[PDB]
């Protein structure tokens, strides 16, 4: 129950809405800020 | 090699002699060492140490001495008074032979410090030795001083001279400031001076020493005519008050009066309630205790008290003008004048030993004061006329004539002169140049040259700093300097110093022609004092700097 994504690879943890949802500091928010914005579009599409 | 003491002298011998008897030396240490069997077994460890056997014993001795000092303090603090005093007396009897030993001298000095009465023989022995006397605490020195008035006077006189010098130097400060003048410090701040604190510590709770100091102050006030001795009397009494010294404050008849006057000085004004309290103190002097009146007059002779009372008198005169009332009908004004009269007559009362209130002259109240009110009245009407619309502006010239009776009052009556001088200071502080020019010719000749006193000149130069822009006018500078300052500067060095200070402060605003004329007129002569020459040199340096700024 402890989500750790490390060096672009999911080490451990189960991703609930607190990991992929609209909460601040989530995986998608950091993917938007650290990576680009086209990359986040690809991220959403691949997940779905 | 005193009582039961081995070699101090043969110790010097032991350091000089140097041949051979080892067993004699060892036996001497055994007999005159730390005579404890328990230490004999512990010494070989010190021998097994390597460091020479001096630092260890010195450290132990110092620790024992400090513990003994702590215990002497504890004995002085704890227990019944008789038992602790007896223990301290026994300890002093056992230890006084070592008073000349530097390592044990602090213990003896502490024991003497905590004793209410040191035996007279030991006190005489201490007095005969300059170093022992110097090392003694003030508590022992009080027991010495109370029965030796000459020695106490020798100790106190430098402080009194220093106090007088400090006051005079404060009167001649380089900075001319209305906000920061001689009367700016609060009484509590003034009592923090080094001389006052040192005198308070020396007197302590001893009434006899306090009376000796009061006698010294009276004698010096009579001999030198310096009012700062009165200032010092007031400050010393109130400094003892601030330390809750009831042994002195309860027996001094001037304590409550001086306290109320100190409050008045702090507020720089005397209200009706405080005036009535001071009057109740004065009227409470019983028949047979009339010398208290001389003491109270000495308190009122304090320049701070005089300044407060005179400023209150001027303010009351202005209020009476506002209220359409005569000076004779105001009891508070009459009371202020009575206090001022006592303060001014202090010297005569003490010198003649005739302790009676000076009679206030009728013509003061009935003539001189309402004429001052007329001067205020002229000022008000001129100010109101200047604000009229231009269509109603008659050519109103300010009244420039000084009545001859006013000048006669300033010349012949001390109280009228004092009140007029403070009125001049008041109008100068208000930047009323017309009234100042009107009254200035009457200050050339005043009662006892009071207009040339250092207090008045200090305040006057400070207030004249507010009229700096008027020094660009040659008529104003001619009036001020030529008609007032230069009339007395050749005969009075202090007037020369005050004029030089004013010129140093205001040279950038003085007209250049008048500036050159004043520089020539204020040139020190061969008989001029060192301070005048120093001030003139400072003025020259400032003038050179100003020329370089062109």
């Amino acid at each position: 129950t402890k989500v750790v994504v490390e060096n672009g690879e999911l080490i451990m943890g189960i991703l609930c809405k607190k990991s992929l949802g609209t909460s601040a500091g989530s995986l998608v928010h950091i993917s938007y800020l650290e990576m680009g914005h086209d990359i986040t579009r690809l991220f959403y599409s691949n997940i779905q | 090699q005193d009582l039961g003491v081995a070699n101090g002298e043969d110790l010097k011998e032991t350091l000089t002699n140097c041949t051979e008897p080892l067993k004699a030396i060892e036996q001497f240490q055994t007999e005159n060492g730390v005579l404890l069997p328990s230490l004999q077994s512990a010494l070989p460890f010190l021998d097994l140490h390597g460091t020479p056997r001096l630092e260890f014993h010195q450290s132990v001795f110092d620790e024992l001495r400090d513990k003994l000092l702590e215990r002497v303090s504890a004995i002085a603090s704890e227990g019944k008074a008789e038992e602790r005093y007896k223990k301290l007396e026994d300890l002093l009897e056992k230890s006084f032979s070592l008073v000349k030993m530097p390592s044990l001298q602090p213990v003896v000095m502490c024991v003497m410090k905590h004793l209410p009465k040191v035996p007279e023989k030991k006190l005489k022995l201490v007095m005969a030795d300059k170093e022992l006397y110097r090392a003694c605490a003030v508590e022992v020195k009080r027991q010495i001083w109370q029965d030796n008035q000459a020695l106490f006077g020798d100790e106190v006189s430098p402080l009194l001279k220093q106090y007088i010098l400090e006051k005079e130097s404060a009167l001649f400060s380089t900075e001319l400031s209305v906000l920061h003048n001689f009367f700016s410090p609060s009484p509590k701040t003034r009592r923090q001076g080094e001389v006052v604190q040192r005198l308070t510590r020396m007197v302590g709770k001893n009434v006899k020493l306090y009376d000796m100091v009061l006698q010294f102050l009276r004698t010096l006030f009579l001999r030198t005519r310096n009012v700062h001795y009165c200032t010092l009397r007031a400050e010393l009494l109130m400094s003892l008050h601030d330390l809750d010294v009831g042994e002195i404050c309860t027996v001094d008849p001037c304590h409550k009066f001086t306290w109320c006057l100190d409050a008045c000085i702090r507020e720089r004004f005397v209200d009706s309630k405080r005036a009535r309290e001071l009057q109740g103190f004065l009227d409470g002097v019983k028949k047979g205790q009339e010398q208290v009146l001389g003491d109270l007059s000495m308190i009122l002779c304090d320049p701070f008290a005089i300044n407060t009372l005179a400023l209150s008198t001027v303010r009351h005169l202005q209020e009476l003008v506002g209220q359409e009332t005569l000076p004779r009908d105001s009891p508070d004004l009459l009371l202020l004048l009575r206090l001022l009269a006592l303060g001014q007559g202090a010297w005569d009362m003490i010198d003649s030993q005739v302790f009676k209130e000076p009679k206030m002259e009728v013509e003061l109240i009935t003539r001189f004061l309402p004429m001052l009110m007329s001067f205020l009245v002229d000022d008000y009407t001129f100010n109101v006329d200047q604000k009229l619309p231009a269509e109603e502006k008659a050519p109103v010239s300010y009244p420039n004539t000084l009545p001859e009776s006013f000048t006669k009052f300033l010349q012949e009556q001390r109280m009228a002169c004092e009140v007029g001088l403070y009125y001049v200071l008041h109008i100068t502080k208000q930047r009323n140049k017309n009234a100042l020019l009107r009254l200035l010719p009457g200050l050339v000749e005043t009662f006892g040259d009071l207009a040339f006193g250092d207090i008045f000149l200090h305040l006057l130069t400070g207030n004249l700093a507010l009229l700096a822009d008027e020094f660009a006018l040659e008529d104003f500078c001619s009036s001020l300097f030529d008609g007032f300052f230069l009339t007395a500067s050749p005969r009075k060095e202090n007037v020369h110093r005050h004029a030089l200070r004013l010129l140093i402060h205001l040279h950038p605003r003085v007209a250049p022609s008048k500036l050159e004329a004043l520089q020539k007129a204020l040139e020190p002569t061969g008989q001029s004092g060192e301070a005048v020459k120093e001030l003139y040199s400072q003025l020259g340096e400032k003038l050179e700097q100003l020329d370089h700024r062109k």
């Binding site: - | 209305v178 209200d271 008000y380 109101v384 930047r431 507010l466």
Partner: protein, 209 residues
């Protein structure tokens, strides 16, 4: 009550001292914060027809520099002040040469006297304060940030640096209680330092209108 009256007078005195100090005047340090017992000792502990009555504690203070201008504060005896009462204070001021002054009214001023106060503004300035305004120094409140009056040179520097006019600054009322506390006139930029949770410190400016 009599103890309540001396407490109220002491609080008004303390607030007036703090107001004068924050305005930039000569306020003695012990006078700036004195004990209530010290006030009672200095004045009399009986405002009810007694020693610490009004007009006894009219505080006269000068400026820290240029010590000429003074605003010696006024405390009327009556609750409801009028023109014939403020003309006595005008007489006392015209007796002097100083133009600023503060009166501390107990109840509301008569509106005719309110107009009269404006009727001498170019000649000599008079401000008025109710008792409830001076029972709390509002600048000590946590909601009130640090207001500092700016000099004209600093106003010129501000307008030249930001290349904007006095018409464009966010403004402040002349009847603003803080503006009344500092007694600022119209057209006098006030810098305001307040802590911000997003930048640490924020300095805004309020031209007076």
């Amino acid at each position: 009550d009599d103890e309540e009256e001396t407490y109220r007078l002491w609080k008004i005195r303390k607030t007036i001292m703090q107001l004068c100090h924050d305005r930039g005047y000569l306020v003695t340090q012990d006078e700036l914060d004195q004990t209530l017992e010290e006030f009672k000792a200095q004045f009399g502990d009986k405002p009810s027809e007694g020693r610490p009555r009004r007009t006894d504690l009219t505080v006269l203070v000068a400026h820290n520099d240029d010590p000429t201008d003074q605003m010696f504060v006024f405390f009327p005896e009556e609750p409801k002040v009028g023109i014939k009462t403020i003309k006595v204070y005008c007489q006392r001021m015209q007796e002097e040469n100083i133009t600023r002054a503060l009166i501390v009214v107990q109840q509301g001023m008569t509106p005719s006297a309110k107009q009269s106060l404006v009727d001498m503004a170019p000649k000599y300035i008079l401000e008025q304060f109710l008792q409830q305004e001076l029972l709390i120094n509002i600048t000590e409140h946590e909601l009130v940030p640090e207001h500092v009056v700016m000099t004209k040179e600093e106003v010129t520097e501000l307008l030249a640096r930001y290349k904007l006019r006095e018409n464009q600054l966010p403004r402040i009322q002349a009847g603003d209680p803080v503006a009344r506390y500092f007694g600022i006139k119209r057209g006098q930029v006030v810098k305001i330092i307040r802590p911000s949770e997003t930048a640490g410190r924020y300095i805004t400016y309020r031209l007076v209108q």
